[PDB]
Design a protein around this nucleic acid. Structure first.
Ligand SMILES: [Ca+2]
Lengths: 538, 713, 181, 246, 289
DNA sequence: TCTAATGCGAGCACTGCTATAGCAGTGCTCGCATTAGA
């Protein structure tokens, strides 16, 4: 029926043949309403979204997905839930079905299966009976000295060593690296006789890289020499090392770093490649954009961190480390909570300032953030600028001066690859893909200033980058990083977005924005589709 | 100028041979007088679409469409994706028709399966929901299209929608003026014009237009069916001749045309054969004019014989005449065009060679004929073309061959140095045995002879044989040993379109069940449910890592719905040595079809390592050079010689002969089951089995296969 | 304006599957199984008739009546089969007196076989019940009232000539119609 | 077998990019490489990209001038024809290879993609024996080889000396298709009624005699046939030798 | 094996060909100019979301099939009398275009008929049959190879347009030079060269102004076409008109980009040039020497 | 890396009986020719 409209929507590039052909074959002979849902389900699907909230579908999209056009949309229909469920290409989950309506969420059966598989993993972790807290406590007291004032890295370790699966979330300012290190020294130390193969791994190869060149460095140190048949210092990207259940991996403990990039599918696939007797320690940044964009899971898994440990778990940790560890709030989602642990920066004099303070600030409030521009005039590190009107041309300038080094190595013909190491010194980042801001638009409006003067993926060399989406920069860094927020608008510019942008900078960091957009960002927080939240509260 | 009766059939060859030695030897050419149709991809492609309404949509035929770039481009499909679509179409079960309507319209029972919609459904279904999970609307999802790649299923499906939209629209008759716009609509609907095809596309619209206009002119009342139009287009497209290069970029190759006699220094006629040149076609026969002829009248015979004259008359320097002297098969003799006969007959009868001045009419005439006729050689590399004189070839390219100046292919196998990396997966000692020669190719020098495509059944399944019957038996088996419900498996299989329709599918099923049950029982009867076991065997300076599934406290209990074979024995022996060296003390059985059975006695972890070492020794040697050992033939010979009684290795002449037979029965099979040695891998080392290498095999495959026989049952 | 068809081997095969499809798919398990036992599939039909179908059709000595349906013959056959399936579901008595050497008491082997040859039919097939007939019963006081077995082993019991006849008559015209179109 | 190799070779040419599909073509026996060769080219990454260029070079010729022209280029380089001919039975192979190229060339002028052609090969390799045109050509020289032919292709032919090694074989006709002895029409008995099979069987040697008569008759000076106390009946040599049925 | 092969001692040297302002237009046109000798070779492409619900000549199907449909229109017209719309619905109906284009098209044809090509009288509508010659076809022999360079120098000197110098994009050619002239008409003493150019879907009006045109002119180096075409008309007239003079009879070259032509916005859509007369001179003898 | 033809009788082994030997019938193993021909 809707055929024309859909097929047209394809002429108008607002959804692909797959979505409508999927829609057509599966519904097609049902209430056009269910037909539309499938199209859009498969569409959000294409953007990495695991499910499609009945909500993004009840009157709001009258100002969202452009197909708010209809003669067939009989009212707000309200009984969307009913219409769907009646059609039988959707089921609550009993019948084998293309689609699943669980929560007030519509799913492509594969997705919903993949979600549940992840829920089951974290509500099935058992307790590493490997207790003798007496002994664990000693090996930890010996690996963590400054445990006088609650050592969160010491806790992480204890959590992780008493659980089969465990997640450690932390910002860049934390010894997540060094913690996983003592964490394992202790695993090795506590392996009476033998049989403990530790294999490392990251989702992206660029990550896998660092894992080793830092998980080794920090690891060869610490007092351990009782034969170092270490961490098999071969990392491997997650999408290497597999290719499964029915042929589980060979290892006792798996340490996945950059966990914030694991996506729903990647999870469920890794899960299956895991033999019941193995221990998985995931490391990641809960408030990094990759943990919240379409298809991610870290963000939702670590959501229940704010719930703290159950009391019994708390008491045990405090018994394990030599410090009282807080708890609170009954035991909903006990199995998850009791095996998560996020780190915090520790104690020193002076500052962490510049990138430091702003970053922390960004993970919360306005008053905090505004008072770091004014404060100390951090001159180097921060560099806010007022972009509006013609100060757009002001930016284009401090933009050609930033890329200074690069452009001169070009001119000075030093044609090696210092041109390469010069480019990763300055970098423009923008929330949008198209526009006066955003990439496409920014590259031009910049190439112009510079003529009138003069493997897997995401490896540079003008993919007409010059400017990147804060999104693609994930897992990268530059000395001077400049961020450009739109003039006034978009939900794409969120708190996480801004956070991960700032955290891309190692020295100077400019933020060409307005104390309206920025602050509006700080207060908005990437929407979160999904059912995990609820699959965890039962 | 070069002329042939049919320029369309010489074209391929003209083009081929004039693709030659770039410098020196090269001279320009253009073919003229070819038929638009026969000389353009899209034209046929389009006549083809004009028949959607009469099509049975067979798989290869739809897929063929995608071989026309412009069409493939229109639905955003690249050669890259086409490769997948091709694989999916085959696996999802597509064979025949578009719809069920289509099938029905063919007065054939709609089965709901095997049509495009079925397979396309299975793939979209498989986009969401994975294969397990179960059948949906009597359809099992197909999961190769699941990830981002599924995006392809979309494009494909869109293409099949379009085709259906048109098969139905071209279906019914229309009044002339109504057909007017169909052509220009189908073009834009299926082709994304190139720059070339743009010209070709315009050519269709013209012919199509002119056709309809001409009808409208005569004011044709009645409605007209597509065939009437499609056929006229076809014909019109076959009479349209392209000869626009007829006199620029030189050396004109074309047919002899009437009313186009131009002077040329050189004129050559090819394939002037009897039955080919004076070209024919009998008048309609109800052509009054042809029976009572008059001076003005024309006929092809006369036109054609007069063209052969105009040729003679227009050549100013040299006339070249050629014909084919005999088909290169039955080697029977040919004959020239009577017109050519007449030409050398009148030459001969009016000339004589300087030598022969006093010999005879008939005598001198023959010599002149024999002197101007120049029999040529079958192959371009025959020495006679490279001697000196009358047309030695200007093609050095074939000189070496001509002079037997080549160097015979050097014996393939040359021992490669090899150092064994302490620690090789079990799987690699598995993959290596169970066909070692193949292994040297695949493992040592990463050469896998993968052949791109594979026969797509020209039809739904009526019968179940070979690989399928195996893949189906595989599960039916595991499901009966697991004492699980066969009925559930049957519906999934039926849901995938793997069984023959209705009762026929059930019947087929019921019987695999029976044979399969009979095996399942020998298994059920001695299975003691255990678990995995991880492998980390230190053995002969190398570790071995991997999983041994279902390890029972008795030993390993294996099974396959296949006949008993030596390669399958070795398979279980490897597994046995490994689990026995892993400590575990116990047995290991392999239950096969027709009651086959390889059963191994428990082995001391000490002797287990000794044995698991020759096996690794083999893998080691066999990575430097193809290690012979043909499990089937070797073990065939090896089975007839070896005796359980006293472990009697027989040598009497009576048996060393029955042996050499069995080996050979095995090496080159029957006319049905068919032979070990018929295998790219072996074929690449020797095309015929020499008595010397038969030996190497025997000895070699004795050395590695013996323990198998010294320990069975 | 004719087009000289060259193959015809594929044209013939396809006609042959069309035949099978429209004459077998719609068939109910009892008949289907019967056919199946005569030919596993259309490839095997063609293998048995392909020669004919080509050039002049031979005359069939004794064709089936110009109308017997698969359905009919089946009936007649089944019915000839079951009436003897009843006069045996009564092996109550068959446990007989007067001897002979050849005929052993491992006849109790022969027995049950057919006793158990009492399925819900589906096959014109019937493993050997030679002994328990009556024609040889005498050839080896002797036997009773199952002279209905003398009668079952007289009449051929097959669907073969009927289907065959139908196939070539039909497969030919399929080919023909296709070639005209 | 030579077709299979041509198929690998073409795949190689249409995409030398894919390390693996090229290695396979270089491995075909037609190219004449060594195990030692294949190995070393796997360890010398500069040499490989050289072969890769060579192959990119072929695709170009293919795209512009045709499959035959490309194949001839390839052959002149790897000096194929010359070497093959030197290699025993190598003439057979070489002329088949050329023959495939002549077919490959026509088929190309009816496809506007190289890949289509490749696909065209696969098909013909998976479901052959079509025309007499894809039949094997006999080599000029087969003329000096003893010639082994069938009784049928021998009708018409004349030979100085002929051998009939198996002229005693029979094979009983078991299908009841016979000609009516009075009406002379062909009758198919759909019930193997013995009277008709008997009539069919007669018609069978009625035919072998004709075959024998064609067989003895091809020679000019001499002919020798093989005879044996042939038996097929599984009747234990009961003074059998059903040689009288041939 | 006492063998060897004949090697030839002649050499390639020169190539004689028949070219036609294809020395320019790179291939793709392979077999294009072959299957349809008069296809609107100057067009090419697809068209998209530029559908705006009110038909304007800019939304007329893009490319060559449609392009040569237009040329067809002006092949046999009665520039003289008014445009029947029935006639037009028939052209569109026969060429397979939707009838609903008749309103926009008939209104388009007249506009383009009643435009002022060279201000002085002009306007196609004032041209009776006897004063037009449609699709003339010329053949110019061109001896002494024509080197892309040597032609560049003088093309530059005499033409302010071809001063946009990227040229000499072709290679040496002796031979012949084919060519079709869309229309040649006369206006009482004075012969002209007209070239109808259906071309590109560049949104609207903004693209058919004296520069933009002059622009596209260089993109497709159409300037080459003028000079060639008039060298043709020149020679032809000189051969026909006994005692003719280039500057007493010529003064032509009009270029109608069919789109971008309104009833009241002259100098929009049309382009005019009048080759140097000193160029033709050299050019003419640049062929024969 | 996947599977791998049937089918027909013989052939020998063995097991009831009944006027040690012949007549018969139960059952698994095994060798054999199958296609054709344009
Ligand atoms: Ca024009």
């Amino acid at each position: 029926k809707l055929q024309k409209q859909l097929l047209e929507a394809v002429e108008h590039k607002q959804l692909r043949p797959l979505d409508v052909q999927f829609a057509l074959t599966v519904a097609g002979d049902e209430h056009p309403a269910v037909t539309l849902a499938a199209a859009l389900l498969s569409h959000d699907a294409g953007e990495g979204h695991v499910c499609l909230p009945l909500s993004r579908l009840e009157n709001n999209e009258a100002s969202h997905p452009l197909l708010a056009t209809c003669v067939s949309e009989i009212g707000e229909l309200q009984n969307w839930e009913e219409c769907l469920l009646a059609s039988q290409a959707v089921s609550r989950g009993d019948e084998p079905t293309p689609m699943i309506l669980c929560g007030d969420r519509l799913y492509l059966n594969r997705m919903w299966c993949n979600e549940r598989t992840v829920a089951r993993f974290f509500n099935e972790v058992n307790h590493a009976i490997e207790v003798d807290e007496a002994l664990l406590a000693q090996t930890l007291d010996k690996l963590f000295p400054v445990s006088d004032e609650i050592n969160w890295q010491k806790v992480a370790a204890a959590v992780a060593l008493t659980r089969r699966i465990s997640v450690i979330s932390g910002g860049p300012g934390t010894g997540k690296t060094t913690t996983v290190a003592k964490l394992l020294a202790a695993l090795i130390q506590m392996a009476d006789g033998e049989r403990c193969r530790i294999r490392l791994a990251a989702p992206t190869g660029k990550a896998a890289a660092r894992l080793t060149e830092s998980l080794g460095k920090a690891l060869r140190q610490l007092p351990l020499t009782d034969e170092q048949k270490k961490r098999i210092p071969e990392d491997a990207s997650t999408l290497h090392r597999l290719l499964h259940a029915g042929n589980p991996l060979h290892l006792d403990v798996l340490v996945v770093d950059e966990a914030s990039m694991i996506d729903l599918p990647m999870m469920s696939r890794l899960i299956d490649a895991l033999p019941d007797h193995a221990r998985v320690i995931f490391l990641g940044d809960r408030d990094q954009l990759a943990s919240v964009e379409a298809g991610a899971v870290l963000g939702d898994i670590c959501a229940y961190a704010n719930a703290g440990f159950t009391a019994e778990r708390a008491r045990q940790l405090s018994r394990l480390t030599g410090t009282h560890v807080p708890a609170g709030t009954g035991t909903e989602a006990a199995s998850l909570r009791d095996s998560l642990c996020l780190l915090q920066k520790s104690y020193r004099f002076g500052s962490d300032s510049g990138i430091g303070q702003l970053a922390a600030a960004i993970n919360r409030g306005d008053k905090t953030a505004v008072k770091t521009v004014f404060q100390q005039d951090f001159t180097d590190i921060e560099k806010r600028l007022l972009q509006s009107g013609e100060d757009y041309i002001a930016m284009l300038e401090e933009a050609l001066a930033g890329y200074g080094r690069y452009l001169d190595l070009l001119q000075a013909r030093a044609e090696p690859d210092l041109i390469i190491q010069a480019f990763n010194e300055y970098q423009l980042l923008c929330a949008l893909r198209e526009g006066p801001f955003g990439v496409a638009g920014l590259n031009e409006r910049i190439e112009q200033f510079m003529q009138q003067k003069r493997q897997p993926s995401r490896l540079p060399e003008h993919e007409t980058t010059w400017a990147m989406t804060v999104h693609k920069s994930q897992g990268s860094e530059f000395d001077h990083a400049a961020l450009i927020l739109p003039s006034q608008r978009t939900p794409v510019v969120t708190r996480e977005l801004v956070y991960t942008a700032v955290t891309r900078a190692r020295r100077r960091l400019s933020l060409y924005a307005d104390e309206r957009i920025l602050s509006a960002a700080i207060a908005t927080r990437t929407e979160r589709r999904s059912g995990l939240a609820a699959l965890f509260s039962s | 100028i070069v002329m042939v009766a049919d320029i369309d059939s010489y074209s391929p060859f003209i083009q081929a041979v004039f693709g030659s030695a770039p410098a020196d030897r090269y001279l320009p050419y253009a073919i003229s007088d070819r038929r638009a149709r026969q000389s353009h991809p899209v034209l046929e492609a389009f006549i083809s679409l004009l028949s959607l309404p009469d099509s049975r949509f067979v798989s290869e035929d739809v897929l063929a469409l995608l071989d026309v770039p412009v069409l493939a481009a229109r639905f955003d499909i690249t050669e890259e994706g086409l490769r997948y679509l091709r694989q999916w179409v085959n696996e999802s079960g597509i064979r025949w028709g578009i719809d069920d309507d289509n099938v029905r319209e063919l007065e054939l029972p709609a089965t709901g399966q095997h049509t495009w919609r079925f397979g396309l459904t299975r793939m979209l279904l498989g986009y969401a929901m994975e294969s397990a999970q179960g059948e949906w609307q009597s359809v099992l999802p197909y999961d190769e299209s699941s990830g981002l790649i599924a995006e392809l299923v979309g494009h494909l499906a869109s293409l099949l929608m379009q085709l259906n939209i048109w098969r139905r629209g071209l279906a019914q008759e229309r009044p002339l003026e109504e057909w007017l716009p169909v052509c220009r609509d189908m073009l834009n609907a299926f082709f994304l014009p190139d720059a070339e095809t743009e010209a070709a596309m315009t050519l269709i619209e013209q012919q199509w237009q002119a056709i309809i206009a001409e009808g409208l002119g005569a004011q044709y009342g009645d409605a007209v069916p597509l065939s009437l139009l499609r056929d006229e287009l076809a014909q019109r497209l076959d009479q349209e001749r392209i000869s626009q290069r007829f006199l620029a970029g030189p050396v004109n190759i074309c047919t002899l045309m009437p009313m186009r006699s131009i002077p040329f220094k050189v004129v050559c006629l090819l394939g002037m054969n009897d039955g080919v040149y004076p070209r024919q076609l009998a008048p309609l026969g109800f052509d009054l004019m042809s029976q009572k002829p008059k001076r003005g009248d024309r006929s092809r015979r006369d036109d054609d014989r007069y063209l052969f004259l105009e040729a003679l008359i227009s050549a100013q320097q040299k006339l070249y005449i050629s014909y084919i002297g005999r088909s290169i098969q039955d080697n029977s003799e040919r004959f020239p065009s009577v017109l050519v006969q007449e030409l050398i007959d009148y030459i001969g009868q009016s000339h004589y060679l300087p030598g022969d001045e006093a010999l005879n009419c008939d005598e001198s005439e023959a010599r002149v004929k024999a002197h101007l006729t120049c029999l040529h050689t079958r192959m371009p590399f025959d020495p006679q073309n490279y001697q000196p004189g009358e047309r030695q070839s200007y093609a050095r390219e074939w000189l070496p061959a001509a002079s037997q100046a080549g160097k015979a292919h050097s014996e393939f196998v040359q021992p490669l140095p090899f150092t064994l990396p302490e620690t090789v997966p079990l799987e690699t000692l598995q993959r290596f045995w169970a066909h070692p020669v193949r292994a040297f190719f695949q493992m040592r020098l990463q050469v896998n002879f993968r052949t791109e495509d594979s026969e797509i059944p020209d039809t739904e399944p009526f019968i179940l044989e070979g690989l399928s019957r195996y893949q189906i038996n595989q599960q039916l088996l595991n499901a009966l040993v697991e004492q699980d419900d066969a009925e559930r498996l049957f519906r999934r299989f039926r849901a995938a379109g793997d069984l023959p329709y209705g009762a026929f599918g059930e019947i087929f099923w019921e019987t695999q069940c029976q044979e399969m049950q009979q095996l399942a029982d020998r298994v059920i009867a001695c299975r003691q449910p255990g678990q995995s076991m991880e492998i980390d065997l230190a053995c002969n300076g190398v570790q071995i890592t991997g999983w041994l599934p279902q390890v029972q406290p008795d030993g390993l209990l294996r099974w396959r719905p296949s006949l008993l074979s030596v390669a399958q024995g070795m398979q279980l022996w490897l597994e046995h040595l490994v689990y026995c060296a892993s400590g575990g003390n116990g047995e290991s059985r392999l239950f096969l079809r027709k009651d086959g059975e390889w059963r191994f006695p428990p082995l001391a972890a000490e002797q287990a390592l000794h044995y698991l070492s020759q096996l690794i020794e083999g893998y080691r040697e066999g990575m430097s050079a193809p290690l012979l050992v043909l499990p089937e033939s070797g073990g065939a010979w090896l089975k007839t010689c070896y005796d359980a009684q006293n472990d009697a290795m027989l040598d009497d002449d009576s048996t060393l002969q029955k042996a050499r037979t069995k080996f050979l029965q095995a090496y080159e099979g029957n006319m049905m089951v068919r032979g070990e040695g018929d295998d790219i891998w072996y074929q690449r080392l020797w095309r015929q089995l020499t008595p010397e290498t038969m030996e190497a095999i025997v000895e070699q495959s004795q050395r590695f296969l013996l323990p198998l026989f010294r320990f069975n049952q | 304006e004719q087009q000289l068809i060259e193959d015809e081997s594929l044209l013939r095969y396809q006609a042959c599957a069309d035949f099978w499809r429209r004459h077998c798919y719609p068939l109910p398990r009892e008949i289907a199984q019967v056919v199946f036992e005569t030919w596993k599939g259309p490839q095997a039909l063609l293998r048995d008739i392909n020669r004919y179908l080509q050039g002049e059709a031979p005359v069939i000595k004794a064709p089936p009546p110009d109308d017997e349906t698969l359905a009919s013959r089946h009936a007649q056959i089944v019915a000839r089969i079951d009436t003897v399936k009843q006069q045996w579901r009564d092996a109550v008595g068959e446990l007989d007196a007067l001897i002979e050497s050849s005929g052993i008491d491992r006849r109790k082997f022969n027995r049950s076989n057919q006793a158990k040859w009492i399925d819900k039919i589906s096959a014109w097939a019937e493993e050997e019940t030679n002994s328990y007939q009556l024609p040889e019963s005498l050839e080896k006081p002797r036997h009773p009232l199952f002279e209905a077995i003398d009668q079952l082993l007289a009449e051929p019991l097959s669907i073969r000539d009927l289907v065959i006849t139908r196939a070539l008559a039909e497969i030919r015209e399929t080919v023909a119609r296709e070639k005209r179109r | 077998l030579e077709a299979q190799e041509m198929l690998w070779l073409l795949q190689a040419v249409m995409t030398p990019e894919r390390e693996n599909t090229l290695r396979s073509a270089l491995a075909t026996s037609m190219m004449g490489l060594n195990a030692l060769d294949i190995e070393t080219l796997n360890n010398d990454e500069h040499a490989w990209d050289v072969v890769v260029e060579e192959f990119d070079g072929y695709r170009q010729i293919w795209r512009k001038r045709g499959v035959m022209p490309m194949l001839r280029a390839l052959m002149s380089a790897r000096n194929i024809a010359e070497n093959l001919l030197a290699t025993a039975g190598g003439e057979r192979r070489l002329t088949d290879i050329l023959h495939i190229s002549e077919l490959l060339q026509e088929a190309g002028t009816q496809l506007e993609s190289e890949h289509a052609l490749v696909r065209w090969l696969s098909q013909h390799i998976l479901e052959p024996d079509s025309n007499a045109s894809s039949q094997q050509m006999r080599l000029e020289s087969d003329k000096h080889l003893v010639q082994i032919v069938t009784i049928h292709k021998s009708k018409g032919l004349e030979y100085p000396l002929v051998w009939l090694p198996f002229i005693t074989n029979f094979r009983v006709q078991e299908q009841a298709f016979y000609h009516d002895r009075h009406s002379f029409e062909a009758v198919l008995d759909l019930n193997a009624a013995p009277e008709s099979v008997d009539l069919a069987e007669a018609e069978r040697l009625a035919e072998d005699l004709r075959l024998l008569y064609v067989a003895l008759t091809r020679s000019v000076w001499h002919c020798s046939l093989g005879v044996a106390p042939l038996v097929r009946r599984r009747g234990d040599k009961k003074g059998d030798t059903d040689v009288h049925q041939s | 094996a006492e063998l060897n092969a004949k090697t030839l001692q002649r050499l390639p040297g020169d190539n004689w060909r028949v070219t036609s302002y294809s020395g320019l237009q790179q291939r793709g046109h392979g077999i294009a100019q072959d299957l349809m000798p008069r296809l609107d070779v100057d067009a090419a492409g697809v068209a998209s979301v530029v559908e705006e619900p009110t038909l304007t000549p800019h939304q007329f199907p893009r490319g060559a099939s449609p392009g040569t449909f237009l040329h067809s229109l002006f092949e046999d017209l009665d520039f003289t009398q008014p445009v029947d719309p029935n006639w037009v619905r028939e052209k569109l109906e026969l060429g397979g275009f939707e009838s609903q284009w008749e309103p926009v098209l008939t209104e388009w044809i007249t506009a383009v008929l009643q435009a002022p090509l060279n201000e002085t009288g002009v306007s196609l509508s004032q041209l009776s049959a006897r004063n037009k010659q449609v699709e003339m076809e010329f053949y110019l022999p061109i001896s002494e190879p024509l080197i892309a360079s040597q032609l560049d120098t003088l093309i530059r000197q005499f033409d302010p347009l071809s001063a946009g110098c990227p040229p000499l994009e072709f290679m040496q050619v002796r031979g012949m030079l084919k060519g079709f002239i869309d229309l040649v008409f006369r206006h009482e003493g004075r012969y002209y060269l007209l070239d109808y150019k259906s071309n590109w879907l560049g949104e609207d009006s903004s693209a058919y102004t004296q520069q933009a045109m002059a622009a596209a002119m260089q993109a497709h180096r159409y300037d080459l076409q003028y000079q060639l075409y008039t060298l043709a008309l020149h020679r032809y007239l000189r051969h026909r008109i006994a005692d003719y003079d280039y500057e007493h009879h010529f003064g032509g070259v009009i270029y109608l980009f069919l789109r971008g032509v309104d009833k009241e916005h002259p100098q929009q859509g049309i382009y005019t040039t009048r080759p140097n007369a000193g160029l033709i001179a050299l050019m003419d003898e640049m062929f024969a020497g």
